[PDB]
Short mmCIF file of C-alpha atoms in Angstrom, two decimals:
data_model
loop_
_atom_site.label_atom_id
_atom_site.label_comp_id
_atom_site.label_asym_id
_atom_site.label_seq_id
_atom_site.Cartn_x
_atom_site.Cartn_y
_atom_site.Cartn_z
CA UNK A 659 15.73 -16.38 -83.22
CA UNK A 660 18.10 -16.25 -85.96
CA UNK A 661 19.26 -12.72 -85.77
CA UNK A 662 22.32 -10.80 -83.97
CA UNK A 663 21.70 -7.35 -85.23
CA UNK A 664 20.49 -4.52 -82.99
CA UNK A 665 17.35 -5.21 -81.24
CA UNK A 666 15.01 -2.11 -81.35
CA UNK A 667 12.85 -3.43 -78.77
CA UNK A 668 15.79 -3.31 -76.20
CA UNK A 669 18.45 -0.81 -77.29
CA UNK A 670 15.75 1.47 -78.72
CA UNK A 671 16.98 1.64 -82.28
CA UNK A 672 13.70 2.15 -84.02
CA UNK A 673 13.47 3.04 -87.72
CA UNK A 674 9.93 2.41 -88.95
CA UNK A 675 7.93 5.34 -87.65
CA UNK A 676 7.82 6.71 -91.15
CA UNK A 677 5.57 3.74 -92.07
CA UNK A 678 2.34 4.76 -90.42
CA UNK A 679 -0.47 6.45 -92.10
CA UNK A 680 -3.17 7.22 -89.45
CA UNK A 681 -4.25 6.23 -85.90
CA UNK A 682 -7.92 5.94 -84.55
CA UNK A 683 -8.73 6.15 -80.92
CA UNK A 684 -12.17 5.59 -79.51
CA UNK A 685 -13.60 4.99 -75.96
CA UNK A 686 -16.56 2.57 -75.47
CA UNK A 687 -16.53 2.07 -79.22
CA UNK A 688 -18.35 5.10 -80.06
CA UNK A 689 -16.79 8.13 -78.40
CA UNK A 690 -13.76 9.14 -80.36
CA UNK A 691 -10.72 10.68 -78.72
CA UNK A 692 -9.94 13.59 -78.41
CA UNK A 693 -13.05 14.52 -80.37
CA UNK A 694 -14.28 18.02 -79.64
CA UNK A 695 -13.34 18.88 -83.06
CA UNK A 696 -9.64 19.53 -81.79
CA UNK A 697 -7.79 18.39 -85.12
CA UNK A 698 -8.35 19.60 -88.65
CA UNK A 699 -9.47 15.80 -89.07
CA UNK A 700 -11.47 15.40 -85.68
CA UNK A 701 -12.03 11.75 -86.52
CA UNK A 702 -8.28 10.62 -86.33
CA UNK A 703 -4.68 11.54 -86.36
CA UNK A 704 -3.26 11.41 -89.83
CA UNK A 705 0.45 11.16 -89.58
CA UNK A 706 0.95 11.50 -93.26
CA UNK A 707 -1.03 11.99 -96.45
CA UNK A 708 -0.26 10.78 -99.97
CA UNK A 709 -2.70 12.92 -102.06
CA UNK A 710 -2.03 16.81 -100.95
CA UNK A 711 -5.56 17.87 -101.77
CA UNK A 712 -5.79 20.75 -99.59
CA UNK A 713 -2.08 20.62 -98.32
CA UNK A 714 -2.37 19.77 -94.75
CA UNK A 715 1.40 18.85 -95.06
CA UNK A 716 4.14 20.94 -93.32
CA UNK A 717 7.82 21.23 -93.15
CA UNK A 718 7.88 20.88 -96.90
CA UNK A 719 6.99 16.96 -96.30
CA UNK A 720 4.23 14.64 -96.38
CA UNK A 721 3.65 15.02 -92.66
CA UNK A 722 0.27 16.53 -91.66
CA UNK A 723 0.02 19.78 -89.87
CA UNK A 724 -1.98 18.25 -87.08
CA UNK A 725 0.47 15.47 -86.40
CA UNK A 726 3.49 17.86 -86.39
CA UNK A 727 1.71 20.07 -83.94
CA UNK A 728 1.03 16.99 -81.52
CA UNK A 729 4.57 15.92 -81.72
CA UNK A 730 5.94 19.43 -80.93
CA UNK A 731 3.53 19.77 -77.82
CA UNK A 732 4.29 16.29 -76.46
CA UNK A 733 8.02 16.93 -76.67
CA UNK A 734 8.56 20.53 -76.25
CA UNK A 735 5.17 22.20 -75.35
CA UNK A 736 5.95 24.33 -78.54
CA UNK A 737 2.95 24.98 -80.83
CA UNK A 738 0.50 27.46 -79.35
CA UNK A 739 2.89 30.15 -79.50
CA UNK A 740 5.11 29.58 -82.69
CA UNK A 741 7.22 27.03 -84.23
CA UNK A 742 10.82 27.21 -83.15
CA UNK A 743 13.73 25.12 -82.75
CA UNK A 744 13.60 24.06 -78.91
CA UNK A 745 16.79 24.42 -76.54
CA UNK A 746 19.44 21.99 -77.07
CA UNK A 747 19.26 20.33 -73.69
CA UNK A 748 15.80 19.22 -74.79
CA UNK A 749 17.05 17.73 -78.07
CA UNK A 750 18.40 14.26 -77.07
CA UNK A 751 18.92 11.40 -79.48
CA UNK A 752 15.37 10.23 -78.42
CA UNK A 753 13.60 13.33 -79.32
CA UNK A 754 11.44 14.28 -82.35
CA UNK A 755 12.84 17.25 -84.12
CA UNK A 756 16.37 15.91 -83.65
CA UNK A 757 15.55 12.86 -85.78
CA UNK A 758 13.14 14.47 -88.14
CA UNK A 759 14.51 14.90 -91.66
CA UNK A 760 12.28 15.99 -94.67
CA UNK B 862 -23.17 -11.56 -83.50
CA UNK B 863 -22.40 -14.27 -86.09
CA UNK B 864 -23.41 -13.99 -89.67
CA UNK B 865 -23.55 -16.95 -91.81
CA UNK B 866 -23.73 -16.00 -95.67
CA UNK B 867 -23.46 -17.38 -99.20
CA UNK B 868 -19.75 -17.24 -100.55
CA UNK B 869 -19.02 -14.74 -103.04
CA UNK B 870 -15.87 -14.62 -105.36
CA UNK B 871 -15.11 -10.79 -104.40
CA UNK B 872 -14.60 -8.59 -101.31
CA UNK B 873 -17.86 -7.60 -99.61
CA UNK B 874 -19.11 -5.78 -96.45
CA UNK B 875 -21.49 -6.56 -93.69
CA UNK B 876 -23.45 -3.35 -93.32
CA UNK B 877 -25.05 -3.25 -89.90
CA UNK B 878 -27.28 -0.55 -88.55
CA UNK B 879 -27.58 -0.50 -84.75
CA UNK B 880 -30.89 1.71 -84.68
CA UNK B 881 -30.36 4.37 -81.78
CA UNK B 882 -31.76 7.85 -80.82
CA UNK B 883 -29.92 10.44 -82.60
CA UNK B 884 -31.46 13.52 -81.24
CA UNK B 885 -30.34 17.11 -80.83
CA UNK B 886 -31.94 20.19 -79.10
CA UNK B 887 -31.38 23.74 -80.49
CA UNK B 888 -31.33 26.58 -78.06
CA UNK B 889 -31.43 30.17 -79.42
CA UNK B 890 -31.13 32.59 -76.00
CA UNK B 891 -30.01 35.64 -77.92
CA UNK B 892 -29.66 37.45 -81.38
CA UNK B 893 -27.21 35.58 -83.48
CA UNK B 894 -26.39 32.70 -81.18
CA UNK B 895 -26.90 29.25 -81.72
CA UNK B 896 -26.31 26.58 -79.02
CA UNK B 897 -27.09 22.87 -79.94
CA UNK B 898 -26.79 19.67 -77.83
CA UNK B 899 -26.38 16.35 -79.51
CA UNK B 900 -27.12 12.97 -77.85
CA UNK B 901 -27.00 9.55 -79.59
CA UNK B 902 -27.76 6.77 -77.18
CA UNK B 903 -26.49 4.01 -77.10
CA UNK B 904 -23.14 4.48 -78.88
CA UNK B 905 -22.62 8.18 -77.55
CA UNK B 906 -19.13 8.58 -79.02
CA UNK B 907 -17.84 5.23 -80.52
CA UNK B 908 -17.13 2.09 -78.30
CA UNK B 909 -14.00 1.35 -76.27
CA UNK C 305 -19.81 16.61 -97.98
CA UNK C 306 -21.55 14.70 -95.16
CA UNK C 307 -20.40 12.35 -92.18
CA UNK C 308 -16.75 13.58 -92.78
CA UNK C 309 -14.90 15.31 -89.99
CA UNK C 310 -12.32 16.27 -92.71
CA UNK C 311 -14.92 18.59 -94.36
CA UNK C 312 -17.55 19.27 -91.55
CA UNK C 313 -19.87 21.88 -92.49
CA UNK C 314 -20.24 25.03 -90.47
CA UNK C 315 -23.09 27.08 -89.23
CA UNK C 316 -22.72 29.22 -86.04
CA UNK C 317 -23.32 32.82 -85.35
CA UNK C 318 -20.80 35.21 -85.72
CA UNK C 319 -21.00 36.44 -82.20
CA UNK C 320 -21.02 32.89 -80.76
CA UNK C 321 -18.39 31.40 -82.98
CA UNK C 322 -19.54 27.86 -81.59
CA UNK C 323 -20.34 25.69 -84.67
CA UNK C 324 -23.68 24.19 -84.35
CA UNK C 325 -22.95 21.29 -86.66
CA UNK C 326 -21.42 18.36 -84.82
CA UNK C 327 -21.16 15.40 -87.51
CA UNK C 328 -19.68 11.83 -87.11
CA UNK C 329 -18.44 9.59 -89.65
CA UNK C 330 -20.50 6.86 -87.87
CA UNK C 331 -23.94 8.48 -88.97
CA UNK C 332 -25.10 8.31 -92.67
CA UNK C 333 -27.17 11.49 -93.77
CA UNK C 334 -27.30 10.48 -97.42
CA UNK C 335 -29.18 6.94 -96.98
CA UNK C 336 -31.28 8.79 -94.03
CA UNK C 337 -32.53 11.47 -96.58
CA UNK C 338 -33.46 8.67 -99.05
CA UNK C 339 -35.56 6.68 -96.70
CA UNK C 340 -37.19 9.80 -95.35
CA UNK C 341 -38.53 10.90 -98.76
CA UNK C 342 -39.79 7.24 -99.35
CA UNK C 343 -42.08 7.69 -96.12
CA UNK C 344 -43.59 11.23 -96.63
CA UNK C 345 -44.18 11.02 -100.47
CA UNK C 346 -44.48 8.92 -103.47
CA UNK C 347 -40.95 7.97 -104.41
CA UNK C 348 -42.24 7.18 -107.97
CA UNK C 349 -42.62 10.59 -109.36
CA UNK C 350 -39.91 13.08 -110.55
CA UNK C 351 -39.05 16.67 -109.52
CA UNK C 352 -36.25 18.12 -111.70
CA UNK C 353 -35.51 20.82 -109.00
CA UNK C 354 -34.01 18.30 -106.78
CA UNK C 355 -33.09 16.08 -109.59
CA UNK D 609 -32.40 6.71 -90.00
CA UNK D 610 -31.14 7.08 -86.49
CA UNK D 611 -28.61 4.43 -86.33
CA UNK D 612 -24.71 3.96 -86.09
CA UNK D 613 -23.27 2.66 -89.20
CA UNK D 614 -20.81 0.01 -89.08
CA UNK D 615 -18.63 -1.79 -91.72
CA UNK D 616 -16.97 -5.09 -91.43
CA UNK D 617 -14.95 -6.67 -94.25
CA UNK D 618 -15.86 -9.91 -95.71
CA UNK D 619 -13.03 -11.85 -97.11
CA UNK D 620 -13.78 -13.52 -100.68
CA UNK D 621 -15.58 -16.89 -100.37
CA UNK D 622 -15.90 -16.30 -96.64
CA UNK D 623 -18.92 -17.78 -94.91
CA UNK D 624 -18.83 -17.17 -91.40
CA UNK D 625 -18.33 -13.58 -89.98
CA UNK D 626 -18.35 -12.93 -86.23
CA UNK D 627 -18.53 -9.26 -84.75
CA UNK D 628 -17.52 -8.38 -81.21
CA UNK D 629 -19.05 -5.14 -79.69
CA UNK D 630 -20.77 -4.00 -76.63
CA UNK D 631 -23.56 -1.59 -75.58
CA UNK D 632 -23.76 0.09 -71.97
CA UNK D 633 -27.49 0.85 -72.57
CA UNK D 634 -30.39 -0.24 -74.65
CA UNK D 635 -31.18 0.79 -78.06
CA UNK D 636 -33.84 0.15 -80.44
CA UNK D 637 -32.95 -2.62 -82.70
CA UNK D 638 -30.73 -4.07 -85.58
CA UNK D 639 -30.90 -3.56 -89.25
CA UNK D 640 -28.44 -4.94 -91.88
CA UNK D 641 -27.43 -6.09 -95.53
CA UNK D 642 -24.44 -6.69 -97.50
CA UNK D 643 -22.49 -4.40 -99.88
CA UNK D 644 -19.56 -4.93 -102.28
CA UNK D 645 -16.39 -3.40 -101.45
CA UNK D 646 -15.65 -2.10 -104.94
CA UNK D 647 -19.11 -0.26 -104.94
CA UNK D 648 -18.53 1.21 -101.44
CA UNK D 649 -16.28 4.31 -101.39
CA UNK D 650 -14.25 4.77 -98.44
CA UNK D 651 -15.68 7.62 -96.58
CA UNK D 652 -14.22 9.95 -93.72
CA UNK D 653 -11.32 10.97 -95.89
CA UNK D 654 -11.59 13.90 -98.55
CA UNK D 655 -10.49 11.42 -101.37
CA UNK D 656 -10.58 7.74 -102.25
CA UNK D 657 -7.54 7.00 -104.56
CA UNK D 658 -8.87 3.38 -104.76
CA UNK E 811 18.90 22.06 -118.23
CA UNK E 812 16.96 22.81 -121.60
CA UNK E 813 17.17 19.13 -122.22
CA UNK E 814 15.14 18.62 -119.04
CA UNK E 815 12.05 16.42 -119.55
CA UNK E 816 8.89 16.63 -117.68
CA UNK E 817 9.05 15.36 -114.18
CA UNK E 818 7.03 14.94 -111.01
CA UNK E 819 7.58 15.77 -107.31
CA UNK E 820 7.87 13.21 -104.52
CA UNK E 821 7.87 13.94 -100.64
CA UNK E 822 8.60 11.75 -97.59
CA UNK E 823 10.65 11.75 -94.41
CA UNK E 824 12.51 9.75 -91.78
CA UNK E 825 12.45 9.68 -88.04
CA UNK E 826 14.51 6.90 -86.48
CA UNK E 827 15.37 6.18 -82.87
CA UNK E 828 12.28 7.97 -81.79
CA UNK E 829 8.72 7.04 -80.50
CA UNK E 830 5.39 8.51 -81.70
CA UNK E 831 3.76 10.17 -78.74
CA UNK E 832 0.07 10.93 -78.04
CA UNK E 833 -0.09 12.44 -74.42
CA UNK E 834 -3.49 11.80 -72.62
CA UNK E 835 -3.84 15.69 -72.00
CA UNK E 836 -6.65 18.05 -72.87
CA UNK E 837 -4.03 20.35 -74.81
CA UNK E 838 -1.41 17.67 -75.47
CA UNK E 839 0.92 19.61 -73.34
CA UNK E 840 2.92 18.00 -70.28
CA UNK E 841 1.66 20.05 -67.10
CA UNK E 842 2.68 17.34 -64.87
CA UNK E 843 3.34 13.49 -64.54
CA UNK E 844 -0.21 13.00 -63.57
CA UNK E 845 -2.02 14.59 -66.55
CA UNK E 846 -5.47 16.41 -65.91
CA UNK E 847 -7.46 14.05 -67.99
CA UNK E 848 -5.80 11.16 -66.07
CA UNK E 849 -7.38 12.74 -63.02
CA UNK E 850 -10.79 13.39 -64.77
CA UNK E 851 -13.71 11.77 -62.83
CA UNK E 852 -15.18 10.42 -66.11
CA UNK E 853 -12.31 7.89 -66.09
CA UNK E 854 -11.60 7.23 -62.46
CA UNK E 855 -15.23 6.72 -61.71
CA UNK E 856 -16.49 4.25 -64.46
CA UNK E 857 -14.56 1.92 -66.48
CA UNK E 858 -14.42 1.94 -70.34
CA UNK E 859 -13.28 0.07 -73.32
CA UNK E 860 -10.56 1.26 -75.85
CA UNK E 861 -10.15 0.35 -79.49
CA UNK F 52 -4.13 21.36 -62.86
CA UNK F 53 -7.81 20.04 -63.41
CA UNK F 54 -9.63 23.24 -64.07
CA UNK F 55 -9.43 26.80 -65.23
CA UNK F 56 -6.92 25.57 -67.90
CA UNK F 57 -8.52 23.80 -70.60
CA UNK F 58 -11.94 24.14 -71.89
CA UNK F 59 -14.59 21.18 -72.19
CA UNK F 60 -16.67 22.55 -75.00
CA UNK F 61 -15.54 21.70 -78.60
CA UNK F 62 -12.92 23.90 -80.20
CA UNK F 63 -10.52 23.50 -82.90
CA UNK F 64 -6.79 24.01 -82.07
CA UNK F 65 -5.85 25.58 -85.31
CA UNK F 66 -8.27 27.21 -87.70
CA UNK F 67 -7.75 27.94 -91.55
CA UNK F 68 -8.73 30.94 -93.42
CA UNK F 69 -9.26 31.33 -97.20
CA UNK F 70 -8.58 34.82 -98.93
CA UNK F 71 -11.64 37.12 -99.21
CA UNK F 72 -9.97 38.84 -102.03
CA UNK F 73 -6.72 38.26 -103.96
CA UNK F 74 -5.00 40.37 -106.73
CA UNK F 75 -2.41 38.80 -108.87
CA UNK F 76 -0.35 41.71 -110.15
CA UNK F 77 2.48 41.34 -112.79
CA UNK F 78 5.23 41.63 -110.28
CA UNK F 79 3.26 41.25 -106.85
CA UNK F 80 0.49 39.19 -105.14
CA UNK F 81 -1.85 40.65 -102.56
CA UNK F 82 -4.33 38.97 -100.43
CA UNK F 83 -6.92 39.93 -97.70
CA UNK F 84 -7.98 37.52 -94.90
CA UNK F 85 -10.69 38.43 -92.04
CA UNK F 86 -8.71 36.87 -89.34
CA UNK F 87 -11.72 36.31 -86.78
CA UNK F 88 -10.84 35.62 -83.13
CA UNK F 89 -13.83 33.71 -81.53
CA UNK F 90 -14.92 34.94 -78.11
CA UNK F 91 -13.44 33.66 -75.17
CA UNK F 92 -10.41 32.89 -77.12
CA UNK F 93 -6.76 34.52 -77.43
CA UNK F 94 -4.55 34.25 -80.35
CA UNK F 95 -0.86 34.44 -80.33
CA UNK F 96 0.32 36.00 -83.72
CA UNK F 97 3.54 34.11 -83.26
CA UNK F 98 1.72 30.93 -84.16
CA UNK F 99 0.17 32.26 -87.27
CA UNK F 100 1.83 31.78 -90.75
CA UNK F 101 1.22 32.16 -94.59
CA UNK F 102 0.85 28.62 -96.18
CA UNK G 52 -57.30 37.18 -92.18
CA UNK G 53 -56.43 40.75 -92.71
CA UNK G 54 -53.94 41.60 -89.88
CA UNK G 55 -51.09 39.97 -87.99
CA UNK G 56 -50.35 37.74 -90.88
CA UNK G 57 -48.40 39.73 -93.61
CA UNK G 58 -46.38 42.78 -93.42
CA UNK G 59 -47.21 46.01 -95.23
CA UNK G 60 -43.68 47.43 -95.61
CA UNK G 61 -41.29 46.55 -98.30
CA UNK G 62 -39.42 43.11 -97.96
CA UNK G 63 -38.03 40.60 -100.25
CA UNK G 64 -39.40 37.03 -100.44
CA UNK G 65 -36.14 35.32 -101.24
CA UNK G 66 -32.63 36.81 -100.79
CA UNK G 67 -29.54 35.75 -102.60
CA UNK G 68 -26.09 35.55 -100.88
CA UNK G 69 -22.67 35.50 -102.37
CA UNK G 70 -19.64 33.70 -101.20
CA UNK G 71 -17.60 35.98 -98.67
CA UNK G 72 -14.74 33.35 -99.34
CA UNK G 73 -14.33 30.43 -101.62
CA UNK G 74 -11.51 27.98 -102.06
CA UNK G 75 -10.95 25.63 -105.04
CA UNK G 76 -9.02 22.82 -103.86
CA UNK G 77 -7.76 20.03 -106.15
CA UNK G 78 -10.55 17.63 -105.34
CA UNK G 79 -12.69 19.97 -103.10
CA UNK G 80 -14.65 23.43 -103.18
CA UNK G 81 -15.28 25.25 -100.10
CA UNK G 82 -17.41 28.39 -99.74
CA UNK G 83 -18.56 30.40 -96.67
CA UNK G 84 -21.66 32.70 -96.62
CA UNK G 85 -22.79 35.10 -93.92
CA UNK G 86 -26.58 34.06 -93.89
CA UNK G 87 -28.03 37.11 -92.21
CA UNK G 88 -31.61 37.04 -90.94
CA UNK G 89 -33.09 40.54 -90.66
CA UNK G 90 -34.77 41.55 -87.63
CA UNK G 91 -38.46 40.76 -87.29
CA UNK G 92 -38.12 37.90 -89.60
CA UNK G 93 -37.87 33.97 -89.40
CA UNK G 94 -36.01 31.62 -91.87
CA UNK G 95 -36.94 28.09 -92.43
CA UNK G 96 -33.76 26.33 -93.53
CA UNK G 97 -35.89 24.02 -95.48
CA UNK G 98 -36.46 26.88 -97.81
CA UNK G 99 -32.80 27.20 -98.40
CA UNK G 100 -30.60 25.52 -100.94
CA UNK G 101 -27.39 25.97 -102.85
CA UNK G 102 -27.52 27.33 -106.54
CA UNK H 305 -1.48 -20.27 -60.52
CA UNK H 306 -1.32 -19.69 -56.85
CA UNK H 307 0.83 -17.74 -54.57
CA UNK H 308 2.61 -16.08 -57.33
CA UNK H 309 2.77 -12.29 -57.61
CA UNK H 310 3.98 -12.86 -61.28
CA UNK H 311 0.70 -14.31 -62.31
CA UNK H 312 -1.82 -13.14 -59.59
CA UNK H 313 -5.62 -13.82 -60.52
CA UNK H 314 -7.89 -11.11 -60.91
CA UNK H 315 -11.58 -10.71 -59.57
CA UNK H 316 -12.79 -6.92 -59.25
CA UNK H 317 -15.90 -4.98 -60.51
CA UNK H 318 -15.66 -3.13 -63.70
CA UNK H 319 -16.67 0.03 -61.96
CA UNK H 320 -14.40 -0.55 -58.97
CA UNK H 321 -11.28 -1.81 -60.92
CA UNK H 322 -9.74 -2.54 -57.50
CA UNK H 323 -8.73 -6.13 -57.52
CA UNK H 324 -10.07 -8.21 -54.69
CA UNK H 325 -7.46 -11.06 -54.80
CA UNK H 326 -4.40 -10.09 -52.82
CA UNK H 327 -2.05 -13.16 -52.84
CA UNK H 328 1.37 -13.70 -51.26
CA UNK H 329 4.19 -16.19 -52.31
CA UNK H 330 4.25 -16.80 -48.54
CA UNK H 331 0.88 -18.48 -48.52
CA UNK H 332 0.39 -21.96 -49.70
CA UNK H 333 -3.28 -22.49 -51.17
CA UNK H 334 -2.53 -25.94 -52.84
CA UNK H 335 -1.54 -27.68 -49.73
CA UNK H 336 -4.21 -25.82 -47.68
CA UNK H 337 -6.99 -27.19 -50.14
CA UNK H 338 -5.79 -30.72 -49.60
CA UNK H 339 -5.88 -30.83 -45.95
CA UNK H 340 -9.25 -29.03 -46.07
CA UNK H 341 -10.79 -31.83 -48.05
CA UNK H 342 -9.16 -34.48 -45.67
CA UNK H 343 -11.01 -32.78 -42.85
CA UNK H 344 -14.64 -32.48 -44.36
CA UNK H 345 -14.84 -35.72 -46.46
CA UNK H 346 -13.52 -38.99 -46.65
CA UNK H 347 -10.39 -38.61 -48.62
CA UNK H 348 -10.43 -42.37 -49.82
CA UNK H 349 -13.12 -42.24 -52.46
CA UNK H 350 -12.66 -40.94 -55.96
CA UNK H 351 -14.57 -38.20 -57.78
CA UNK H 352 -13.60 -37.89 -61.58
CA UNK H 353 -14.77 -34.36 -62.11
CA UNK H 354 -12.29 -32.86 -59.81
CA UNK H 355 -9.76 -35.54 -60.63
#
C-alpha cells in the first residue's frame, strides 16, 4: 500500500461512476431482472449510450432515459409524476442529482 | 463442461445450444384480445 | 429485428394493449427459421419471393 | 430450434475452455459449434460499432 | 465566427461522491426498508443463483 | 405493501410515441400523436414531455 | 362442395395496410400497422408479409 | 476454524437457507475431540490419515 491520498473505499470519495456502460442482472442464469419488459431495453440497464441512434439520452447528456428514471426513483421517488428538482433536505452530498453535472 | 479444441490465431466463440422446450399457448377469449403464455424449461429466465 | 429487447416487435389488440410478443435475446429466431426450412422442403431450389 | 443460445469467448491460441452453469430441471440435449468473433455481430443492442 | 470550420458534438457527464442504485422493488420506489419483492414468496421459499 | 400496489404482468414503465402526422411550415412545426392509455392504467401528464 | 365453404358476398382476398406511424431512425426504421380482421373472417399470419 | 463467530462454518439446505451450525466461542471443539479419542481408542497408536 504505497498511497496516502483519499480512500474512496472508506471516506466515500468515489469519482468513477461515469465509467460504466451497462449492467445485466439475471436469476438462475436465465430469468433476467426485472424483466417483464419494464425498461426500454428490458434485457439490461444501459447507463449511457455512445451512438445516439434513437436518442435514449436525456438531460442533454449521454445518459439513457431508463437509467435517469431509475436513479430518480431510488433517490427521491420522483419520475412517475414528472421530473423536478427534489427538496433540498433530500439533496445531500451523497445524493444523485446533487452531483450530476452534464 | 470442458471443451478442448485446436488453437487458432484469432478470437473465436463457443456456440452452445441447450436444447429445451420453448412453447407458448395463445388464448383469444374476446374480440381483439390476445393473451399468450410462454414457457421455456429449463432456463425459464436466465440462470442465477 | 429479432431476439432484441431493444427493438422488440409488438402485436396486441387495441383493447388489450398487452403485447403478445415476448422475445428474449437468448433465443435465436433467424437460425431457427433456417433449419426449419431444411426439414420441410428441399433447401436446394430457389424462390425469389422470399429471396 | 427450441434451445437457449450461449456464447463464450475463446482467447486466441486458447486450447481449454471451461463453462460453469446449472439447470434446476431436465432439458433435451446439447448442441454446439465454433464461430469467429469478427464474423459474429453482437446482438441485443440496436447497433454494433465494432 | 465566419472562419468557423466544420466540427462535431460530444456529450458526457460526471457524478462523484455517489453510488449507483438499483432498488429491489417492483417499481424501484422506496415504500419501506423491507421492500415488497424482498418479501415475495418466490424468494423466501426457494433459493436462486445470481449473475 | 405486498399486494394491490404493483402489477405482476409485463408492462412498460415509459412508452414512446411517434408522430402520426407532421407538417413543417416555413415558420412553424406541427405534429399530432395518438396518446393511447392502455386499459387498467393511469397516465399523469406531468410525466409526459416532447423529446 | 357447394355450400359452407366460400362466401357469396363481396370480400377482398388480400388486403393492404398503410403505416399509421413511421419513424426513420439513423440506424433503424420502425412502423406500426393497425391489422384489422373483419368479422366473420380468419387471418393466417403465415400469409402476411412486409412489402 | 472452530468456536469462532468470525469464521463460523455453514451447513444448510439450499431451500432452507437456515444454517444448522451454531457455534459459540465459549465452547472448545478442539480439546473436546482430543479427549473423545482417548476414551474410545488407544491413543498410543498412530494413524497417518488423520495425522
